[PDB]
């Protein structure tokens, strides 16, 4: 074939424009709502748990093949990222987490790739600075619908400069997106939790207006028409009402014509607690997390056995896969190809598939193993032969690692 | 190096799950080894699809597209694309090339859910602060100082319920007695939410909707959501194996007649301790032999296929089709 | 490449200014609310549990490689910090915990690094004094958006001096931040618990 | 709360390793390029009785040998790292970086 004669079309319709139909959440005004939802206890709890569980995923660089060139470039980009926590490069890998959490909250976030020249003739990754989506006005596009460049206009901290219209190409940057439709349009993940949040705030204000009626009672007082405003009797009636509100122990002393009374609402206050728990359940359900981790399990039954995976486990796997896919598509080819033009299979970033299993089963298995080794004279070498003779899943379950990861990390 | 085309298939499939029909292009540049490399796959959102053309025998012919290039560059109109350059995904197709969406049954519960939320929002404003009423004599008309004073009394009863009410001996301030408690609409909300989650085909334990109903005792041979997630993977694999694979193999091998297939692994959460005890029995059998690893691997590949899968050791076929 | 031609931009918008949108929690008035929330039973209980569980984490210095130079400098900075509880250096490692808990409550806290000369020709870490964020007015910034120096104005205890406008460079200090956005702006962790506390 | 208390320790260790350590190593070693790192131990509350049964199997393996302790310690450091951490025996690296 010649090429792609079909452009990347918008997701727009007559009402729905760029994955959004609400005018309140249409442009950058939706970013205000997405930022104000960070003031929630439930939302910040779920985000702290999800992002902390992302940050402890036991990442490892996987090379292309068993060739020493692939292992060399894999250890190279491992030193560039610093999967082990600290290095001399001022920790760029957590800046990727910051850009990813901004792209999870807002839908699209980006960052720069600074490539100074190392002393060994290699292009060291110097630093990665984030780009907050408040500062991003638009993103440019190619004629085939794909993106072209990033238009920025923000404010340098300290009030130094008012940068305006700064256009940055993509090949110097990395762009993260949540639940992209393949068309380069990142919808935010906080989209479904907006109406429950708004109804939650309105319901809190309704409870604040209702308790002031049902707990002290609104006073009413009937006077004859002889008393008008600004008189001593008018000030006395003001004093009676203010003392009924503020100091309810001086009592009420009335002439034989005045009828002090509370306005009879003639109904008890309805229990709004189930509606609050319903909208809080709506928020935590829209975030995709179970009600046991975030403390919202209230009288509902615990999970009996569960499925093959859990809800929050599948959510936290699916986010790690999107993060690893975005890193492996955008950051890695901008690092390997300027230092190896002849590369064609990039080393990949993959987490370890964790599985909480019993240590006692591994202990009994290891006891059987040393029972097998016991009759032999030389214990450790024949033991390690029995260890690496095992299948891969049991060898992972014992906690012994292969030589590939220790050869890609320590050298 | 191919910029990850396989997740674009997932994006097209999820668009076809939501909307009923989605598609994408197949860009085939020429590789350096004389083979037609799959260069990229761009999605086609069903908002941009107006119609699909058809053959005279009822089968489809081409895809009619009219959308908007991002950045406001072009307004593409009536762009007709043949099928043999594309892939088309469908949910629950009737064999007649018509993809009904999967969100079809969850529409009326959703509409009733929204109307019920608006009814609760109109009902709480009545049952929690109470609508005020006030009777004045006919001497007071609109726009007077007494009329503004009555407005001020009602507005202070709504907004600042601590200044109190001070009335002349003729006015009767009152709340309108609805004479009934507010009915509990929470079961109706949970009913329509159960209708939505039941129409999606998922159990009430994964999505957090289990509210006072009993947990599953043993279950059946499979679960609800397990059968749903198997049945969707089978449709996705069938669509890939029918449309994408013959457009890749036949331009690079015209003499092919049995295409390689795409299949997932049938997962089965079993106990590791049973596999640990089995492996302990295996090394008990190997223990009397001198050379442990080669006779051990002979005992391993001498096993039946299900137990060999349960130990986690893979065959040479998958490692010979992946690593080379 | 040449370098970073893109400055560290603010998180500001027309209403949201520096990770905050409420005018009550906008400037140092939010620090008053963050300090008054320490009078809660729930908040002080959770902070005591979390900080006590941080202080018993079984920390260990991990060296760079198995080379004796890396092990030597690792044991050097281990003696500088004193991961084992006491030493002659008057316990600087718990001062780091104090600075970190101030940065957890308020969003940003800092401390000084005093480097006297040891008798063995090595720069011993002498002491670390905390800097409470009540005393911090502003932080200076480089032209590329990164921070430059710390502007301080507080009161010496005993009513001795009223220090004003004391500018301190960063390379003599350490700065802790909670949930930094990579742009050097530390939002506090007590942000979401404010409206429930007021209600 | 376990993920919260891990995520705070990681932020504290990252802040220490980025700001305090290079201001200590580089004024005393200008030729340094890989700083030593601060990391906590990943705790895991496991059963002591499983470790007791494992140690019983270990001394059953050592029992036929004449010299118990040296061959025992050879069997100990021949173990994988997770089980060796679970027995509570530490490596020589931490005791060589603390006590000297």
Author numbering:
A (entry chain A): 26 to 436
B (entry chain A): 113 to 436
C (entry chain A): 26 to 224
D (entry chain A): 337 to 436
Verbatim from the authors:
To gain knowledge about the structure of the dynamic DNA tunnel, we utilised a thermostable bacteriophage, P23-45. The portal protein oligomer is a ring of 12 subunits, with each subunit folded into Crown, Wing, Stem, Clip, and Tunnel loop domains. Structural information about the portal protein is important not only for deducing the mechanism of capsid assembly, but also for understanding molecular events associated with genome translocation into preformed capsids, and genome ejection during infection.
The in situ structure of the portal protein within the procapsid was determined by localised reconstruction of portal-containing vertices to a resolution of 3.7 Å by averaging around the 12-fold symmetric axis. The in situ structure of the portal protein differs from the crystal structure globally, in changes in domain positions, and locally, in conformational changes such as the inversion of the tunnel loop. The Wing domain pivots ∼8° downwards, towards the Clip. The tunnel diameter at its most constricted part is wider by ∼8 Å. Residues 330–335, which protrude into the tunnel and are part of the longest helix in the crystal structure, instead adopt an extended loop conformation in situ, facilitating the tunnel loop remodelling. These modifications alter the shape and surface properties of the tunnel, which widens and changes from hydrophobic to hydrophilic (compare Figure 2E,F). Movement of the Crown creates space between the Wing and Crown, which allows remodelling of tunnel loops, facilitated by an unfolding of a 5-residue segment of the long helix (residues 331–335) within the Wing domain. The unique conformation of the portal in situ demonstrates that the capsid plays a role determining portal conformation, allowing DNA to pass through the tunnel, whilst the portal has the ability to modulate packaging activity and slippage by switching its tunnel properties so that it can engage and disengage with DNA.
